[PDB]
Specification:
Blueprint (H helix, E strand, L loop, with lengths): L3 E3 L2 E3 L1 H17 L27 E4 L15 E4 L5 E6 L9 E2 L5
Antiparallel strand pairs: 1-2, 3-4, 4-5, 5-6
Amino acid sequence: QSATTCGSTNYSASQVRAAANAACQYYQNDDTAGSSTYPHTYNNYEGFDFPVDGPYQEFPIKSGGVYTGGSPGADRVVINTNCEYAGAITHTGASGNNFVGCSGTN
């Protein structure tokens, strides 16, 4: 969580940290802030994984602040099941449904 640029959509170390500290407070055991599915365990599949442990979960970001639910939501920050930032991925530079890594994430 140190200034991630998701292709074109820039996110301050403040924004990554805000969304993650939020995702953290919500996914642990305090509130069910709207959401159809997010946050929820980023279970199985290849393509992407983070050098940590998990089980990690998704939290889709926005270029304004923490969780709004505007749609689309290509840009998504992903955390660990405590309070640690896993990485930041986005559909920005991807093939529609696919994903790519933001600045720092690889």
